[PDB]
């Protein structure tokens, strides 16, 4: 069971420097006398690691309270401990650190390791009460007071202690690196005797891998379990604890870095170079031996014209009546705001097939014009409304060009278009003299010749009318049911846009590197005042014909010339 | 309302030279001091443009009449007017220029422009009557006599006048380019003062875009709107009109050309180069700076071997005797040539139900095997030979599985199988225990048990023989008449074909560059008589191992060697 301790009182943080510590073997590969470049999660050199006393005496009276805060776990942790009496005992990892979510507990008693993952009910101040026996004093018996309850245990592990016995200035430095990658909790460790160094010593020791646990949980925070040698019921005036917490632990956070590791002849890492530290290190990593990039944009500018009218999709999609597949209904959409989320998220349609444009970005593009085609087609022939396809509908009634850009919308319409007797107002051609060109529409009714004799406008032997009716009945099968079809072909040209998405114009910043979007033209660069004169029909500028050097702002008619941000 | 004028009398055409006029800005992009190559509809340099007097006085009496003919609109029109008194007022564009097809009317009065897209009923001589006021004379009042009625208006535009006021040798040149592309009527214009030049001046002036109308109609012809200051009721002897039509207008037709345009420092097009005009201009375009391709074969030759192994379709369709409807005559057709045209083109048969294959491409398809089924049936039962159908024949006689590929052909056989006394040699089952499987041939004569008692091969009460005979007589009605029926089931498998269509050959042209197809070997080249000797088993020749230098013609065995057409 747990025991409540005093409030931690939010001690101010204190920092120290990590002089090239925390380098671990990233792989299990023996490389000898070679310099290998690895891009992994490393502790950056000469970083500030935050250090906490195990026992802090900060009160005027002389109160002794553990400094045991809950800390973040940002893509790994480098945990170093300078101690002499085994006061640090283990860690607890998780997101919420209660019974809602699973947690990992690693503890060290005098004998072995305890590794568990359960739905662990940790109290506010976990610790282990440590007491010696009355006669031997060789080992210290530990009473856990970490959690109230544990359930749903999915892992158990026991091995030789992570922490050696420390049972008077023979301090020891124990360094661990914890990573949580691909469901695996990886622990690396190294133990080094230290002498007369209060902070992290200056030197190099590489961390050998210790364990990989197939843990498979989510970790965001962690804590440290400490050993209470004194009594919580009766706190002594002084010396009941361990010399007012001389021993302490330092925490640093790993980051994605590129390191140059030097494996010596016996296969051990002897030195490392942090490429991002100083330009000398950048040079060393460039030569792989031990002996414009300055400006980025911070803000984005969106500029679009004053347009408020809404594009008449409802007159096309919520329309009452739709044309025959040889009389294709083309409606032009322009000078209005088009909200494609209404159509995309409604989900009434069955076919959302968009070519040349991803369907989630129509709100992010502005086009010169939209062409909306209304159709009443079979289910089975819906597969024929797409570029590069063949078939009666795709060959004789409407061809999408092989480079078509736009979206084909297909939705069923049994309860609108079918009637009990079969709705026969939709006529489709079975025969034609030759194949169409894309977006061609022939409404000719000339009776075709099937034989060698001419028909002269009269059907008969090898003479047929082009048009057949369609048995659209509410009892027909899915392949034979009616599907209302609209094709939106979007025109993206070097012409000013009339149909725009639900965007927001922003302010204009000048003489600064910025991400810009003028009338749909996206880019990154700096803008200056230009003395160029644009004729009123002109909108862009390209003196070199492969980059837009100038542009006209849509709101203010001033002409701004664009210099590339890279120098 | 319109006023009838005199007959135009079809004045002979007159031409003039266009010294590099009609260059317009193709894009809306500012370019400075750069040479840009654009392929677009441009008026070719030094072309013949046809010029008409606004008022022509050609009669001996001195008859004065507008030269206002309806001219074609071939992929755009360059229209220039040299004038000083605003006697040209606008144009009308369309196909039929009546109430049958939509028309576009552009007219300029003293105040603004009027642009309409409607159903105008244009008269033969549309025009504007111009009269000054009695006191001011600063502006001219116009009476429109252009169209009788206007309906179904789908457009309207008003803006600043296209033609400036011209209110004595201060002639002015107004140049327009009209294009009708992608449903857009694009007008480019330019105005330049001219001096002492009767025809088009020598020089260069670029036509800046004036407007883009989304009229989206079909235009094939166009006309010009002229104004009579004179009176049609009372024509004066002379000087009633404007100095005998000194002003005039020139029309030329755009063509797809590649131009090199020179944008100067201020962004104006100063000079252009027409890449197809001379070899010189061709060099300038190739170097993008201002400072065997000759033979192409005209005809095609196909030579294929003789069509000898011909189908015994005559033994099937012209057979004297067709088997009984319960001994279906199934005949193998293979290893021979199949001319289905003879049968289809003859069309002496009544049916050609071809399923899975169109009947006109049967000659183009060489199949693996052919099954020919021959018999005679009643006409009212002919409808039962198709898959998915039911009935006595379809369920009990010969089941056609829903996935047929093949043709059913039936023809009248009244004068062949019918006799006066009734031809009962054709036997028909009306009873069976169960329906068939497809293409099953049951020729059993077992007496069927209609009751509960067994028949033991003896008719009686509820015992009947299977076959009843047919009363084929020459006086029977169409439904009861005999019908000779043959079903060709065609096998398309992953197996080599044995029945092929009549491979049609052509004539041979020697010593001329030609597309050739010898025995499936297709190529382009010239053919000569060769002295090579081929072994009888050899068909082509390849002396260099990568090009076929020689070939043996399939029909006449001479050996023709192929010289590449490119010299």
């Amino acid at each position, epitope marked *: 069971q747990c025991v409540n301790l005093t409030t931690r009182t939010q001690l101010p943080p204190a920092y120290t420097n990590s002089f090239t510590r925390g380098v671990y073997y990233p792989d299990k590969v023996f490389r000898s006398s070679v310099l290998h470049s690895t891009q992994d999660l490393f502790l950056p050199f000469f970083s500030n690691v935050t250090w906490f006393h195990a026992i802090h005496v900060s009160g005027t009276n002389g109160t002794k309270r553990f400094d045991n805060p809950v800390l973040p776990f940002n893509d790994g942790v480098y945990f170093a401990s300078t101690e002499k009496s085994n006061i640090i005992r283990g860690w607890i990892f998780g997101t919420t650190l209660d019974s809602k979510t699973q947690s990992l507990l690693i503890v060290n008693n005098a004998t072995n390791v305890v590794i568990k993952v359960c739905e662990f009910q940790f109290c506010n101040d976990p610790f282990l009460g440590v007491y010696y026996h009355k006669n031997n004093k060789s080992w210290m018996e530990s009473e856990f007071r970490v959690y109230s309850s544990a359930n749903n245990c999915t892992f158990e592990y026991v091995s030789q202690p992570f922490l050696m016995d420390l049972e008077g200035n023979f301090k020891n430095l124990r360094e661990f690196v914890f990573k949580n990658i691909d469901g695996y909790f990886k622990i690396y460790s190294k133990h080094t005797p230290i002498n007369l160094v209060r902070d992290l010593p200056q030197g190099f020791s590489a961390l050998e891998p210790l364990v990989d646990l197939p843990i498979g949980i989510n970790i965001t925070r962690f804590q440290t379990l400490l050993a209470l040698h004194r009594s919580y019921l009766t706190p002594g005036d002084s010396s009941s604890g361990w010399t007012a917490g001389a021993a302490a632990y330092y925490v640093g956070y790993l980051q994605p870095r590129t390191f140059l590791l030097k494996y010596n002849e016996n296969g051990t890492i002897t030195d490392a170079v942090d490429c991002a530290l100083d330009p000398l290190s950048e040079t060393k990593c460039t030569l792989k031996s031990f002996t414009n990039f300055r400006v980025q944009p911070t803000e984005s500018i969106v500029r679009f014209p004053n347009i408020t009218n809404l594009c008449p999709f409802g007159e096309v999609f919520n329309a009452t009546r739709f044309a025959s597949v040889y009389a294709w209904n083309r409606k032009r959409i322009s000078n209005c705001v088009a909200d494609y989320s209404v159509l995309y998220n409604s989900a009434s349609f069955s076919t959302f097939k968009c070519y040349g444009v991803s369907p989630t970005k129509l709100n992010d593009l502005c086009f010169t014009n939209v062409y909306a085609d209304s159709f009443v087609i079979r289910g089975d022939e819906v597969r024929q409304i797409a570029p590069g396809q063949t078939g009666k509908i795709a060959d004789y009634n409407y061809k999408l060009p092989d480079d078509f850009t736009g979206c084909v919308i297909a939705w069923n319409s049994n309860n609108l278009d079918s009637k009990v007797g079969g709705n026969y107002n939709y006529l489709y051609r079975l025969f034609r003299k030759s194949n169409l060109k894309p977006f061609e529409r022939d409404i000719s*009714t000339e009776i075709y010749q099937a034989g060698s004799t001419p028909c002269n406008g009269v059907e008969g032997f090898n003479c047929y009318f082009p048009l057949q009716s369609y048995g659209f009945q509410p009892t027909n099968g899915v392949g034979y049911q009616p599907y209302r079809v609209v094709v939106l072909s979007f025109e993206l040209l070097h012409a000013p846009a009339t149909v725009c998405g639900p965007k927001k114009s922003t302010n204009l910043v000048k003489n600064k590197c910025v991400n810009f979007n003028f009338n749909g033209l996206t880019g990154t660069g700096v803008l200056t005042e230009s003395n160029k004169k644009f004729l009123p029909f002109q909108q862009f500028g390209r003196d070199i014909a492969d980059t837009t050097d100038a542009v006209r702002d849509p709101q203010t008619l001033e002409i701004l010339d664009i210099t590339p941000c890279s120098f | 309302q319109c006023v009838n004028l005199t007959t135009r009398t079809q004045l002979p055409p007159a031409y003039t030279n266009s010294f590099t006029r009609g260059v317009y800005y193709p894009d809306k992009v500012f370019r400075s001091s750069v040479l840009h190559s654009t392929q677009d509809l441009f008026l070719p340099f030094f072309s013949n443009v046809t010029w008409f007097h606004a008022i022509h006085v050609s009669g001996t009496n001195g008859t004065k009449r507008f030269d206002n003919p309806v001219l074609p609109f071939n992929d755009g029109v360059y229209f220039a007017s040299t004038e000083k008194s605003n006697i040209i007022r606008g144009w009308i564009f369309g196909t039929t220029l009546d109430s049958k097809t939509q028309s576009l009317l552009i007219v300029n009065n003293a105040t603004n422009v009027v642009i309409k897209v409607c159903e105008f009923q244009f008269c033969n001589d549309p025009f504007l009557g111009v009269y000054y006021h009695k006191n001011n004379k600063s502006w001219m009042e116009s009476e429109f006599r252009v169209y009788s009625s206007a309906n179904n208006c789908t457009f309207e535009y008003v803006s600043q006048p296209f033609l400036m006021d011209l209110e004595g040798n201060f002639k002015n040149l107004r140049e327009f380019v009209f294009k009708n592309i992608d449903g857009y009527f694009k007008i480019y214009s330019k105005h330049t003062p001219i001096n002492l030049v009767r025809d088009l001046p020598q020089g260069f002036s670029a036509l800046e875009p004036l407007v883009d109308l989304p009229i989206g109609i079909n235009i094939t012809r166009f006309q010009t709107l002229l104004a009579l200051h004179r009176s049609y009721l009372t024509p004066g002897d002379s000087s009633s009109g404007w100095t005998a039509g000194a002003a005039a207008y020139y029309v030329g037709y755009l063509q797809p050309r590649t131009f090199l345009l020179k944008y100067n420092e201020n962004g104006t097009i100063t000079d252009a180069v027409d890449c197809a005009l001379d070899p010189l201009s061709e060099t300038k375009c190739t170097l993008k700076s201002f400072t065997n391709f000759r033979v192409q074969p005209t005809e095609s030759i196909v030579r294929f071997p003789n069509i000898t192994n011909l189908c015994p379709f005559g033994e099937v369709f012209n057979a004297t005797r067709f088997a009984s409807v319960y001994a279906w005559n199934r005949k193998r057709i293979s290893n021979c040539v199949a001319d289905y045209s003879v049968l289809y083109n003859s069309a002496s048969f009544s049916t050609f139900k071809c399923y899975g294959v169109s009947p006109t491409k049967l000659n183009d398809l060489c199949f693996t095997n052919v099954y020919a089924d021959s018999f005679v049936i009643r006409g009212d039962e002919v409808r039962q030979i198709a898959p998915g159908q039911t009935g006595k024949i379809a369920d009990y006689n010969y089941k056609l599985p829903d996935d047929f590929t093949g043709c059913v052909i039936a023809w009248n056989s009244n004068n062949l199988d019918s006799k006066v006394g009734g031809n009962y040699n054709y036997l028909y089952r009306l009873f069976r225990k169960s329906n068939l499987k497809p293409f099953e041939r049951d020729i059993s004569t077992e007496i069927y048990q209609a009751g509960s008692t067994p028949c033991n091969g003896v008719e009686g009460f509820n015992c009947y023989f299977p076959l009843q005979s047919y009363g084929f007589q020459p006086t029977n009605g169409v439904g009861y008449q005999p019908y000779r029926v043959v079903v060709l089931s065609f096998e398309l498998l992953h197996a080599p074909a044995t029945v092929c269509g009549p491979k049609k050959s052509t004539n041979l042209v020697k010593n001329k560059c030609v597309n050739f197809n010898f025995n499936g070997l297709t190529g382009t080249g010239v053919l000569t008589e060769s002295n090579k000797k081929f072994l009888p088993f050899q068909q082509f020749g390849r002396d260099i191992a990568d090009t076929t230098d020689a070939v043996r013609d399939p029909q006449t065995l001479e050996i023709l060697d192929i010289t590449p057409c490119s010299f």
Partner: nanobody
Framework: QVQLQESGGGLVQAGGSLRLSCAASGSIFSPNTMGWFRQALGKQREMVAV???????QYANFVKGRFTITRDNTKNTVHLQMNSLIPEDTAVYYCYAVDKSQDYWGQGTQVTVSS
């Protein structure tokens, strides 16, 4: 709301004559195609005849040389002269205004011929 007014049917003895009339009103875009279709109880819409704006007349084989369509350009109306009537023509007929894209439909005219 383009409307097709259909009139002129009824009961006529075998061999008689009738004149149906269809008036198309409203938008009825100028390049139109006016057609007449047949439907008997238990049967299909049998496409009787079609006239375009080109003045061309198109007829099926069922009524060869018997039915004629005349046009009125002033009112853009259509009249079906139905002569040499046979009981096989007993069917309700309808008008098909192709128009440009919006294809319209009539209300119907009963035509009965029997003796």
């Amino acid at each position: 709301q383009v409307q097709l007014q259909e009139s002129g049917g009824g009961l006529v003895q075998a061999g008689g004559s009738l004149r149906l009339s269809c008036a198309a009103s409203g938008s009825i875009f100028s390049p139109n195609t006016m057609g007449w279709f047949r439907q008997a109880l238990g049967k299909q819409r049998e496409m009787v005849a079609v006239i375009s704006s080109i003045a061309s007349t198109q007829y099926a084989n069922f009524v060869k040389g018997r039915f004629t369509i005349t046009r009125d350009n002033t009112k853009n109306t259509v009249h079906l002269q139905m002569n040499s009537l046979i009981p096989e023509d007993t069917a309700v007929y309808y008008c098909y205004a192709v128009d440009k894209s919006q294809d319209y439909w009539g209300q119907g005219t009963q035509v009965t011929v029997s003796s």
